[PDB]
């Protein structure tokens, strides 16, 4: 079973699923004038991504059309994006999200940071393969052309998916690395950024947790305070994201959802990416952390800043109140 499915998702396989039944219902809802969005919503948000792909294969066969194109020609705005995101294979969606983050004059460093720090090593290998297949350029090369300095080096390190996959924790290595981090930053003039990058990007999460514990004992401070006093810019943000994900990935993503839902305006691109990409992995834990940290559920948060068909689809993905 797939590397894209976790133990705490809000979207699961539908036992009574029938691809020909669903494809026929979707074709009816989008064909002719008017669209039955409640129908598209009731089906697609109640099928896992694996089943949706079966709907996709069954729709191209029977109607000679790609469901993605039917959805895009009929739907609009944020609802359209969210609906198209649901029927995209997970590796392909992250690849498209990575490419979107580096297009035009701007560059969305925050999205780059979010994706490269939360995907496991096996997921990154998949994303790199899909990116290469769909864009015919390596992910490393595009990352390289849109970034510079230490941030660039750390992103390229992450894009390779070589973070240690072992399940072992070595007390001895943790103490040694804590000492190297201290010498690389606090203990010298300047900083050996390469060392920060090498340890924080290649040791396993459980190993790093131990390392941060040892770091605190040696330095009398948290690794976060050293990163803040030693580094700056996007490189600093990247390293803090790694530390936050090492301690609690769902809380980091909950914070990202929180920031996308308030302020100057709603960040629908981030909301869509997190809701869809974590729906079959850990959205349930994201919901728990969101409520623990903010005092209100993700569900009520979505209800207060979104509306219409877009709001219903996100509430259905959310799967419940906390
Ligand atoms: Ca129509
Ligand atoms: Ca760009
Ligand atoms: Ca220093
Ligand atoms: Ca330096
Ligand atoms: Ca700083």
**CATH no. for 249-320:** 1.10.220.10
The pair of three-digit structure tokens given for residue 116, joined into one six-digit string: 């490269």
Residue 269 backbone phi and psi in degrees, to 5: -65, -45
CA distance 131 to 128: 5
What's the 64 CA to ligand 3 centre distance in angstroms?
62
Q: How far is the CA of 256 from the centre of ligand 4 (A)?
A: 30
| Residue in the structure block whose two tokens are 């690389």 | 184
Q: Are 82 and 313 in contact (CB under 8 A)?
A: yes
- Are the C-beta atoms of 319 and 8 separated by less than 8 Å? no
Closest by CA to 182, choosing from 154, 215, 140, is 215
Question: Distance (Å, rounded) from C-alpha 241 to C-alpha 249?
Answer: 9
Phi, psi of 6, rounded to the nearest 5 degrees: -115, -170
Task: Tell how far the Cα of 248 is from the centroid of ligand 3, in angstroms.
Answer: 27
Q: What's the CA-to-centroid distance between 236 and ligand 3, angstroms?
A: 14
The DSSP code sequence of 215-266 is: HHHHHSS-HHHHHHHH--HHHHHHHHHHHHHHHHHHHHHHHHHHHHHSTTS-
Give one DSSP letter per residue of 277-298, joined into a string. Answer: HHTTTTHHHHHHHHHHHHSS-H
Cα 150 to ligand 4 centre (Å): 9
Instruction: Give residue 10 CA to ligand 1 midpoint distance, Å.
Output: 30
Q: Which ligand ends up closest to the CA of 104?
A: 2
- C-alpha distances out from residue 112 to 86, 131, 322, Å: 20, 14, 29
Q: How far apart are the first and last CA of the chain?
A: 29
| Alpha carbons 267 and 322: distance in angstroms, whole number | 23
Query: Looking at the CA of 98, which ligand is closest?
Result: 2
DSSP element (H, E) containing 203: none
Residues 21/290, Cβ–Cβ less than 8 Å: no
According to CATH, what is the number of the domain 89-162?
1.10.220.10
Which residue reads 């009520």 in tokens? 300
Residues 52/322, Cβ–Cβ less than 8 Å = no
Widest CA span in the chain: 70
- Which residues, including other chains, have CB under 8 Å from residue 78's CB and lie 6 or more apart? 268, 272, 310
Q: Which CATH superfamily is domain 16-88 in?
A: Annexin (1.10.220.10)
* Ligand 3 centroid, distance to 253 Cα (angstroms): 30
Q: Which ligand is nearest to the CA of 239?
A: 5
Question: What is the SS3 string spanning 75-123?
Answer: CCHHHHHHHHHHCCCHHHHHHHHHHHCCCCCCCCHHHHHHHHHHCCHHH
Alpha-carbon span 212 to 217, nearest angstrom: 9
For the chain, helix, strand, coil in percent to 5 are 70, 0, 30
The ligand placed nearest to the CA atom of residue 182 is 3
Instruction: Write the CA distances from 104 to 108, 130, 167, 233, integer angstroms.
Output: 10, 21, 40, 21
Half-sphere exposure of 47 (CA within 13 A, CB side): 26
Ligand 1 centre and the CA of 36: distance in Å?
8
Asked if residue 256 lies in contact with residue 249, where contact means CB atoms within 8 angstroms, the answer is no
Rounded (5°) CA angle 267-292-112: 35
Residues lining ion ligand 3 (Cβ < 5 A) are: 191
The Cα 208–Cα 203 span in angstroms is 6
**Closest Cα to residue 101, out of 117, 84, 113?**
113
Instruction: Say how many Å lie between the CA of residue 192 and the centre of ligand 3.
Output: 8
Total residue length of the chain: 322
How far does the centroid of ligand 3 lie from the alpha carbon of residue 237, in Å? 17
Which ligand is closest in space to the CA of residue 71?
Answer: 1
What resolution does the deposited structure have, in angstroms?
A: 2.0
Per-position DSSP letters for 179-198, written without gaps between them: HHHHHHTTTSSS--HHHHHH
The CATH superfamily assigned to 163-248 is Annexin (1.10.220.10)
**CB atoms inside a 10 Å sphere around CB 147:** 20
**1: DSSP letter:** -
Torsion angles phi and psi, residue 53, rounded to 5: -65, -30
Q: Domain-by-domain residue ranges, the chain?
A: 16-88, 89-162, 163-248, 249-320
C-alpha count within 13 angstroms, C-beta hemisphere, residue 268: 14
Distance from C-alpha of 38 to C-alpha of 24, rounded to nearest angstrom = 15
């Amino acid at each position: 079973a797939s590397i894209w499915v976790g133990h705490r998702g809000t979207v699961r396989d539908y036992p009574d699923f029938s691809p020909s039944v669903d494809a026929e219902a979707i074709q009816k809802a989008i064909r002719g004038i008017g669209t039955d969005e409640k129908m598209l919503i009731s089906i697609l948000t109640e099928r896992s991504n694996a089943q949706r792909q079966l709907i996709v294969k069954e729709y191209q066969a029977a109607y000679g059309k790609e469901l993605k194109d039917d959805l895009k020609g009929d739907l609009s705005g944020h609802f359209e994006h969210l609906m198209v995101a649901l029927v995209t294979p997970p590796a392909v969606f992250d690849a498209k999200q990575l490419k979107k983050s580096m297009k035009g004059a701007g560059t969305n460093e925050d999205a780059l940071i979010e994706i490269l720090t939360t995907r496991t090593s096996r997921q990154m290998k998949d994303i790199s393969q899909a990116y290469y297949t769909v864009y015919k350029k390596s992910l490393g090369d595009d990352i390289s052309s849109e970034t510079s300095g230490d941030f660039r080096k750390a992103l390229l390190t992450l894009a390779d998916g070589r973070r240690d996959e072992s399940l072992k924790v070595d007390e001895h290595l943790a103490k040694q690395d804590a000492q190297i981090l201290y010498k690389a930053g606090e203990n010298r003039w300047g900083t050996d950024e390469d060392k920060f990058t090498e340890i924080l990007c290649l040791r396993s999460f459980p190993q790093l947790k131990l390392t941060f514990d040892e770091y605190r004992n040696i330095s009398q401070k948290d690794i976060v305070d050293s990163i803040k006093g030693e580094l700056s810019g996007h490189f600093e943000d990247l390293l803090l994201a790694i530390v936050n994900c090492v301690r609690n990935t769902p809380a980091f993503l909950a914070e990202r959802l929180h920031r996308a839902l308030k302020g100057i305006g709603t960040d629908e691109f981030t909301l869509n990416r997190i809701m869809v990409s974590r729906s079959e992995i850990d959205l349930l834990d994201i919901r728990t952390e969101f409520k623990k940290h903010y005092g209100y559920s993700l569900y009520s948060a979505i209800k207060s800043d979104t509306s219409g068909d877009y709001e219903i689809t996100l509430l259905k993905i959310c799967g419940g109140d906390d």
